[PDB]
Design an enzyme around this catalytic site. Structure first.
Site, short mmCIF file in Angstrom:
data_model
loop_
_atom_site.label_atom_id
_atom_site.label_comp_id
_atom_site.label_asym_id
_atom_site.label_seq_id
_atom_site.Cartn_x
_atom_site.Cartn_y
_atom_site.Cartn_z
N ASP A 155 -18.74 51.08 13.75
CA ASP A 155 -19.53 52.19 14.32
C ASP A 155 -18.68 53.24 15.05
O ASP A 155 -19.24 54.11 15.74
CB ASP A 155 -20.69 51.66 15.21
CG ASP A 155 -20.18 50.85 16.38
OD1 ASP A 155 -18.95 50.96 16.67
OD2 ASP A 155 -20.98 50.10 16.99
N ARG A 186 -18.46 57.95 17.91
CA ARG A 186 -19.27 56.75 18.00
C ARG A 186 -20.62 57.08 17.35
O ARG A 186 -21.21 58.10 17.66
CB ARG A 186 -19.46 56.39 19.48
CG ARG A 186 -20.44 55.24 19.74
CD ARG A 186 -19.94 53.92 19.15
NE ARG A 186 -20.68 52.72 19.58
CZ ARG A 186 -21.86 52.34 19.08
NH1 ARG A 186 -22.46 53.04 18.11
NH2 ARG A 186 -22.42 51.23 19.53
N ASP A 238 -25.45 49.70 16.43
CA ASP A 238 -24.40 48.84 17.00
C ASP A 238 -23.96 47.89 15.90
O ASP A 238 -24.73 47.04 15.46
CB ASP A 238 -24.98 48.07 18.18
CG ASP A 238 -23.92 47.33 19.00
OD1 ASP A 238 -22.75 47.74 19.04
OD2 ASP A 238 -24.29 46.36 19.66
N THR A 239 -22.71 48.00 15.49
CA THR A 239 -22.09 47.01 14.63
C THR A 239 -21.45 45.88 15.47
O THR A 239 -21.07 46.10 16.61
CB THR A 239 -21.03 47.69 13.72
OG1 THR A 239 -20.17 48.55 14.51
CG2 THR A 239 -21.72 48.56 12.66
N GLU A 280 -18.42 43.71 16.84
CA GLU A 280 -16.98 44.02 16.97
C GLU A 280 -16.22 43.31 15.85
O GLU A 280 -16.72 42.34 15.25
CB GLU A 280 -16.45 43.58 18.35
CG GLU A 280 -17.16 44.17 19.56
CD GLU A 280 -17.03 45.70 19.66
OE1 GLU A 280 -15.93 46.21 19.29
OE2 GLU A 280 -18.01 46.38 20.08
N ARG A 331 -15.83 59.85 23.46
CA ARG A 331 -16.19 59.72 22.05
C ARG A 331 -17.29 60.70 21.70
O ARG A 331 -18.26 60.85 22.46
CB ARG A 331 -16.64 58.27 21.74
CG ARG A 331 -15.55 57.22 22.04
CD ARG A 331 -16.00 55.81 21.66
NE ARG A 331 -17.23 55.47 22.39
CZ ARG A 331 -17.84 54.31 22.30
NH1 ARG A 331 -17.32 53.35 21.53
NH2 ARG A 331 -19.02 54.14 22.92
C1 THP Z 1 -24.01 54.71 21.08
C2 THP Z 1 -23.78 55.10 22.52
C3 THP Z 1 -23.01 54.32 23.33
N1 THP Z 1 -22.78 54.66 24.65
C4 THP Z 1 -22.03 53.78 25.55
C5 THP Z 1 -23.02 52.68 26.02
C6 THP Z 1 -22.10 51.47 26.30
O1 THP Z 1 -21.55 51.60 27.64
P1 THP Z 1 -20.66 50.30 28.02
O2 THP Z 1 -19.27 50.39 27.49
O3 THP Z 1 -20.59 50.32 29.61
O4 THP Z 1 -21.24 48.90 27.52
C7 THP Z 1 -21.02 51.65 25.19
C8 THP Z 1 -21.33 50.89 23.89
O5 THP Z 1 -20.42 51.40 22.92
P2 THP Z 1 -19.75 50.27 22.02
O6 THP Z 1 -20.82 49.53 21.26
O7 THP Z 1 -18.77 51.07 21.04
O8 THP Z 1 -18.94 49.23 22.93
O9 THP Z 1 -20.98 53.06 24.90
C9 THP Z 1 -23.41 55.75 25.17
O10 THP Z 1 -23.24 56.08 26.34
N2 THP Z 1 -24.15 56.56 24.38
C10 THP Z 1 -24.40 56.24 23.08
O11 THP Z 1 -25.12 56.98 22.42
CA CA Z 2 -20.06 47.94 18.58
#
Ligand code: THP
Ligand code: CA
Length: 129
Positions: free
Chosen positions: A15, A29, A34-35, A37, A75
């Site tokens: 993702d 991103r 959510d994929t 890891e 991102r």
């Molecule tokens: C998809 C997305 C993720 N994020 C943030 C939420 C999560 O915060 P946290 O890192 O504190 O868990 C993280 C999840 O991304 P990842 O799934 O790439 O880890 O990225 C956003 O803020 N907005 C979004 O639209």
């Molecule tokens: Ca992920």
């Protein structure tokens, strides 16, 4: 929403992906999904699927939603298309991602993706198997 040009710099995982957008390198991103890891179950398959999809494409497009375009990590947050086909939706349809991270005001394609999730779940694909 509008599709805008970009070119692949490199696949990362299910993702996220590194694209050149308005001439600048950026990690994107994928919205609304959510994929797993890479080190998790179906993580390697999600990575392979996203990678093939972007590397095979003649045309990559980025589509921002109505809300914030960058997350707290810097991102880009977008829907990514490969030759007209949305990578976000395709991952969900194959059961390689869950619909997730649905925040108010960046959720235009929510119901399109939930419909894809429901059909992936019916077929018990991958994550749903
Ligand atoms: C998809 C997305 C993720 N994020 C943030 C939420 C999560 O915060 P946290 O890192 O504190 O868990 C993280 C999840 O991304 P990842 O799934 O790439 O880890 O990225 C956003 O803020 N907005 C979004 O639209
Ligand atoms: Ca992920």
């Amino acid at each position: 929403l509008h599709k805008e040009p970009a070119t692949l710099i490199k696949a990362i995982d299910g993702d996220t992906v590194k694209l050149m957008y308005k001439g600048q390198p950026m990690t994107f991103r994928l919205l609304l999904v959510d994929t797993p890891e890479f080190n998790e179950k179906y993580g390697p398959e999600a990575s392979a699927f996203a990678k093939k999809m972007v590397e095979n494409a003649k045309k990559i497009e980025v589509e921002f939603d109505k809300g914030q375009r960058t997350d707290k990590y810097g991102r880009g947050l977008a829907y990514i298309y490969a030759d007209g086909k949305m990578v976000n939706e395709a991952l969900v349809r194959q059961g390689l991602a869950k619909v997730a991270y649905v925040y108010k005001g960046n959720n235009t394609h929510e119901q399109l993706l939930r419909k894809a999730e429901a059909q992936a779940k019916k077929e018990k694909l991958n994550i749903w198997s």
